[PDB]
Design a protein around this ligand. Structure first.
Ligand SMILES: CCCCCCCCO[C@@H]1O[C@H](CO)[C@@H](O)[C@H](O)[C@H]1O
Ligand SMILES: CCCCCCCCO[C@@H]1O[C@H](CO)[C@@H](O)[C@H](O)[C@H]1O
Ligand SMILES: CCCCCCCCO[C@@H]1O[C@H](CO)[C@@H](O)[C@H](O)[C@H]1O
Lengths: 403, 403, 403
């Protein structure tokens, strides 16, 4: 029944089937080799790992009665996704036409891949079952891997910090999915689509770990040590500038000049997304400050004006405002990456192909999102009703100390 | 008086005596030497350090009115324990028959030793005074050091991630202690032996830092870089698989298919414990996925069925269900370590001695737990009454903003 | 109007002006170079980065209705401060009489500089607007840079962990500022100048990340690997001993022997501050244990007896008791640094100049604090009234789920 949110058969079936398949496929394909890349790369892996599980995980706990599902479903989707990503990204790097040799570099890329699903989760947060999220993860990891392969291998595009492959891709995939999953009577749940004091403090845990570790995120897969150092510092600068302009615009747009925690939790991160592609390329930090400057402003304007417009007029219900953080700043990051790439004819042509990568990313996000959206819209997955969204009690036993 | 929980003389006396003794013993024995092991090992130290103080610390804050004592007593017991561990573990490595030369490697092992006490704390949490915890730490660190010496030095057993030396040892020591400390009327406090919404979110801080950093935990003291890399990735895999099966079984065992935060906070960590010994030995990741697969299932079944049975029929009151996370998966880890070790005659004999190490660990945990249990049962230490357990107000001034 | 806390023009103006100036000055002066210092130093940078944004940020969230402003204003002041510090500290290291070449070492020092402002923020927390904090940061970063230059370059003083340059300087600057900003009717807000249960748990996030990462804080800029290793372990020891004596004295001073979370959150950190200067110099760990031993006691006595006395008799309103953590232990750290430095004539003279550095730091903190205090006291900045302190609602839109 379409009203049945009882997942006692379906969720275990989905989890166990997926995990058995992971076991079989690891047995067939995945192997180990027999100073280290471990020592020089593991620290970057850990920072990205924290951003996925604690950064995105707690960021989404701002919802007053959706904290368990935010951190807990993120935990679940990412635990599955990292395994499936190792395989999908792996298959584009077979050794002996049949082995995926895994090292720390594979783990780093698997977490980046999953980060795109954490982005998409932000659009549909509160309105989808954990079964829908696992199905989304299954298809989105595949699509991410194919898009990444087209960009990095076929088009020879550079995108170290994933403004295109992670943020633009994840955002517009997520937003396409959420549009297909449009809920006409979502206002029936709107009393829970907000924060309470304590949930905004938990969410700042997420914000701060993303913001602090983003310089590793953007530098982890830069190749030369020289560009890695530059990627990190440019990201650090862009993020710093983003905080001041996000705060400035949050205040400016409020009638009493008061700040809004949605802006401080989310718009302050836009400078990280926007230098994903360019951070490793920019020879001077002042440009990174400008990117952070502009994107804090644009992100905050997006939350205030664009989100309500897109929901009202275009039927895009975007719980975490991922369009304002990952989407628009992702596209900006892609464009700035192209311009920075172009700065002889070989430079000019690199610039054009960076743009090709952006357009390919968007096409894949749209087409992929339509397909996955339509699958997720089927009434089989235990999704809640329009008046039961943003409510943990639908999928969790609620604490005994409360009830 | 046995009803007197006023620690104004006894707690300061205990803290100051212990710390003065640490000062004297450091003065006599502890010295420094006069790329670096600092650079290559300090990062692993920090990850383990976080798991001890923030991981276990916040994990135990799920108790609705025991958050201060959970994080705060963990802080206190570990601050003492790391110092005493440096000495106890140190004495088994005298230089010049009388000096303990400390480097980062000593700090790593001291934190591992204390992790075993954090495990044991999980069984007695809410029912013991901070004085009892310091006394427990004093004796348990000593017992840990002797057990570790027997296993690693005398039996030449391998246990990089401590499935035996930390988890099995800590769990069955803790459970033996809690059995001796059995409280006939504990149901009088049962209204506080649970979570509220916000305490389950704080506890997820603990869960996630343990889960994310466990790959360092299991690889920190692996010797070759080759096995270290393998230890980390096998742990990462086992933990991933553990989340999916823990979630599957939590749902399956609920009448409405709903998830339980006790399972998501604790059973999701069982795959880390279970590959402690084998992670560095397993040449293929698919085996690690299987270990995580099985242990998520077993851990969750333990929480639902074994914990109530052991409390009902065997009088084992296990606050954090450490038997389900550290105990059974610890023994499994020890057994899988033996089988993996055995996979010529030298391999076969290594296998048998791994099993000897498991049996020795259990014997030490039982005998040590009986002795320490009986000391802790003495009415001198300011332990609370059966109707005043899981209540911070017994040992803390409660916030002025509330009262 | 002096009663006008509406920052809709003033806060955006302040943020945008400051950030545009940062952009211009980075464009003129700041450049990049064209194994790595990145690899060996970035990890230490990250630990310090976490201490600034999450450590100090969450530490100050103990205030029951000031959690947003504590973590959020810290975020804002530090985001500005790191940029301005890169410039101010940079100008004392021009290349080509006009370029600041930034690497990871610059980022580490910029975060240390900002840490001093996080300290000062602790005195004025709850009673100053975000505009006052940005103005304070602007001047305090400049003063920090000049004081650091006098000490390190002109006086050839050693202070790796900043007992003088960060803690003593920050504390007495902050306390001078707060004295000039004395509020006669602050008791009108005293119902919010306290914690609730959940705010004390958030604050422990801050406490624990400071405590765990402090060994990196104190070793990050030690030059030789030998002294770095020593700085870290001495800090680890001092902090451990500090917890036991802080707990002992918290209990001893309570009529019922109960612990106070103010002491466990703050006094437990005093051993880190007190070995800032000496940690890299002390050849034996037992001395570090003694410093932590004494400073836990002194810090806790300060919270109980000195804070109320200084507020009552000397009109020093110190929200976070920074005198007890950063001030007195900072001066102790400076004194122990001198004695440790002195332990031939060249050693003796180093000792005297360490003391000169302490006296210069205090003079700069006082003079600088008077000037900045008087500027901040002007009624232009949107500071709240005496009955509206420690209240987020003054500067933030409050969560919709509550209102
Ligand atoms: C969001 C759009 C803002 C405009 C982009 C910021 C300016 C680009 O930054 C550029 O960095 C280069 C480093 O390679 C410098 O050579 C250029 O002078 C600088 O303009
Ligand atoms: C919890 C018990 C589950 C059974 C143990 C998991 C299977 C052991 O994993 C083993 O790893 C080895 C790597 O050295 C491989 O060679 C073996 O093929 C594989 O079975
Ligand atoms: C807070 C004041 C407490 C007194 C200071 C602690 C003692 C100083 O510690 C000193 O460390 C030296 C290492 O260089 C040792 O040589 C000395 O024996 C030891 O006393």
């Amino acid at each position: 029944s379409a009203w049945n949110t009882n997942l006692r058969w379906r969720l275990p079936l989905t989890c166990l089937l997926l995990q058995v398949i992971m076991v079989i496929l690891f047995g067939v394909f995945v192997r180990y080799d027999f100073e280290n890349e471990f020592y020089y790369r593991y620290p970057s892996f850990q920072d990205v790992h924290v951003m996925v599980f604690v950064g995105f995980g707690f960021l989404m706990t701002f919802l007053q009665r959706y904290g368990f599902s935010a951190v807990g479903f993120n935990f679940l989707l990412a635990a599955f996704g990292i395994q499936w990503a190792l395989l999908m990204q792996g298959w584009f790097h077979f050794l002996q036409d049949r082995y995926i040799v895994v090292g720390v570099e594979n783990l780093i890329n698997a977490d980046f891949c999953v980060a795109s699903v954490c982005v998409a989760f932000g659009a549909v947060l509160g309105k989808v079952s954990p079964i829908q999220l696992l199905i989304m993860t299954f298809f989105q990891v595949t699509l991410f891997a194919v898009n990444e392969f087209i960009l990095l291998n076929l088009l020879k595009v550079k995108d170290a910090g994933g403004s295109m492959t992670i943020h633009t891709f994840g955002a517009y995939f997520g937003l396409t999915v959420t549009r297909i999953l449009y809920r006409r009577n979502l206002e029936q749940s709107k009393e829970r689509q907000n924060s309470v004091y304590q949930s905004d403090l938990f969410a700042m845990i997420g914000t701060l770990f993303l913001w602090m570790y983003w310089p590793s995120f953007n530098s982890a897969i830069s190749y030369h040590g020289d560009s890695q150092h530059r990627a990190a510092i440019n990201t650090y600068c862009s993020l710093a500038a983003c905080v001041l302009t996000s705060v400035a615009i949050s205040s400016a747009l409020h009638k009493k000049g008061k700040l809004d925690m949605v802006h401080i939790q989310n718009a302050t991160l836009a400078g990280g997304v926007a230098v994903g592609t360019a951070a490793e390329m920019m020879l001077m930090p002042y440009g990174a400050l400008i990117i952070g400057f502009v994107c804090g402003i644009i992100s905050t304007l997006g939350f205030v004006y664009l989100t309500p417009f897109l929901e009202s007029r275009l039927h895009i219900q975007d719980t975490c405002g991922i369009n304002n953080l990952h989407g628009i700043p992702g596209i900006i990051g892609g464009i700035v990456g192209a311009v920075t790439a172009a700065s002889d004819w070989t430079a000019r042509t690199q610039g054009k192909f960076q743009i090709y990568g952006l357009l390919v990313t968007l096409a894949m996000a749209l087409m992929g999102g339509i397909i996955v959206g339509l699958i997720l819209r089927l009434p089989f997955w235990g999704q809640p009703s329009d008046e039961n969204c943003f409510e943990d009690a639908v999928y969790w036993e609620m604490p005994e100390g409360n009830s």
